[PDB]
Amino acid sequence: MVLSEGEWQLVLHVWAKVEADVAGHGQDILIRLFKSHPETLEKFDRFKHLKTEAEMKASEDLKKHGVTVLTALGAILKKKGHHEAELKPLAQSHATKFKIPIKYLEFISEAIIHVLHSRHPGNFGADAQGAMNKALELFRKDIAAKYKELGYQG
Numbered sequence: 429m430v431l432s433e434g435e436w437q438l439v440l441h442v443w444a445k446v447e448a449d450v451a452g453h454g455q456d457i458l459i460r461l462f463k464s465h466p467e468t469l470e471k472f473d474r475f476k477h478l479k480t481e482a483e484m485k486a487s488e489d490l491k492k493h494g495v496t497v498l499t500a501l502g503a504i505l506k507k508k509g510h511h512e513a514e515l516k517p518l519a520q521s522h523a524t525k526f527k528i529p530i531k532y533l534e535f536i537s538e539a540i541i542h543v544l545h546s547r548h549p550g551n552f553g554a555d556a557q558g559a560m561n562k563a564l565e566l567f568r569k570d571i572a573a574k575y576k577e578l579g580y581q582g
């Protein structure tokens with residue numbers, strides 16, 4: 429797939445808002461993922477112990493890891509499709525070290541869209557959401573192909 433420049437503009441416009449509070453969005457997104465799809469929490473030895481939203485919210489390590497996630501994702505989006513180098517080490521660790529199936533990348537993509545829709549309704553209308561979904565679908569497709577080359581494709 430190929431996004432038009434118009435579609436990237438919509439993606440990066442909303443993302444500029446997200447970057448005003450990377451830690452806060454990171455927390456919201458991972459908490460949404462873990463509440464909506466509790467099975468994903470089991471992939472994180474680091475956080476597996478967290479029982480409630482309240483404990484997740486209070487967790488400093490979890491907040492630090494959401495910054496890491498969104499920083500990495502933000503660097504990929506700003507490449508506007510030219511992300512091969514950024515994707516290689518991410519694919520390798522998530523395929524070989526953590527074993528994260530593509531279905532779980534779908535789940536976090538849904539969590540991202542949910543939080544952006546909640547926090548940025550004015551900059552995340554139907555067209556902006558379609559553009560962000562396309563950018564994330566592009567991301568998942570490219571990571572799936574790399575997974576395959578690496579021997580995983582999960």
Ligand code: HEM
Nearest residue numbers: 468471472474496497500501517518521526528532533536
């Ligand atoms: C937008 C999707 C994602 C991005 C951009 C992302 C980014 C990252 C980054 C940058 C790291 C640290 C460096 C590395 O090991 O490569 C990381 C660690 C990790 N990721 Fe992801 N990730 C994503 C989705 C997921 C999902 C969906 C899961 C689990 C269901 C996951 C599980 C993990 C685990 C287990 C770690 C290690 C945590 C620790 O430090 O103990 N990731 N990810």
